[PDB]
Design a protein around this ligand. Structure first.
Ligand code: QQ4
Ligand code: U3A
Ligand code: MN
Ligand code: MN
Length: 180
């Protein structure tokens, strides 16, 4: 092992996000020491969800990402069985209480159009909202409803570009970009 990417991941993201990403990949049969770009991407996706949920009031979002698969489904079932929304086929990331809809947050190294289409084809569920960010400052949301005020989303974009810069400064961006 001994990747430059792994050491960069541990010093760039906070320990809790690193710990959560280690559990997730290990739960799905992968190891942060080999699939190190997936390690960087899992942390990134985790941090974005956290900043996103931090963008609302206080009780607006229920965080689904960053839970055990069984407990995340339990919370999803309780949300469906109390508000009345349909149960998604694939685990979402958040649930907007203000807007009464699940949210699937994506972070891609391609143009937001293609990644959105793949997840919109994977979901095929309508209902759940889709919101994609990219490492180049662009975003894409369902029905152009970007959910959060603009300010919050702007932060996420800045954070994503800083991650890209630190990766490129360490000459690890090109392998990270051409790996998704
Ligand atoms: C710094 C702050 C942390 C917070 C994220 C989040 C932390 C944990 C809760 C801890 N754990 C562990 C398992 C059971 C449990 O509850 N997780 C992860 C799953 C959802 C969740 O709440 N927290 C804690 C305080 C409120 C909150 O949102 N934030 C918000 C900004 C970015 C960030 O990291
Ligand atoms: C197939 O690979 C997997 C699958 C899982 C199951 C749980 N996963 C999610 O629920 C999930 N997964 C991804 C994603 C997919 C492939 C590569 C990178 C990511 C990314 F961005 F995290 F970095 N994007 C999301 O938005 C998202 O909600 C875990 C670990 N690996
Ligand atoms: Mn998810
Ligand atoms: Mn997601």
């Amino acid at each position: 092992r001994g990747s430059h990417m792994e050491d960069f991941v541990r010093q760039c993201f906070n320990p809790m996000i690193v710990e959560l990403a280690e559990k997730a990949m290990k739960e799905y049969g992968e190891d942060p020491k080999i699939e190190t770009n997936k390690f960087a991407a899992t942390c990134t996706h985790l941090e974005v969800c956290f900043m996103y949920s931090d963008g609302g009031s206080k009780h607006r979002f229920e965080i689904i990402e960053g839970r055990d698969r069984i407990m995340a489904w339990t919370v999803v079932n309780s949300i469906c069985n109390t508000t009345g929304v349909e149960k998604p086929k694939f685990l979402p990331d958040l649930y907007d209480y203000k807007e009464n809809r699940f949210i699937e947050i994506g972070v891609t190294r391609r143009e937001v159009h293609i990644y959105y289409l793949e997840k919109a084809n994977k979901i095929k569920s309508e209902k759940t909202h889709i919101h994609i960010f990219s490492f180049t400052g662009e975003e894409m949301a369902t029905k152009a409803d970007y959910t959060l005020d603009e300010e919050s989303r702007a932060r996420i974009k800045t954070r994503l570009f800083t991650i890209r810069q630190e990766m490129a400064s360490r000459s690890l961006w090109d392998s990270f970009r051409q790996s998704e």
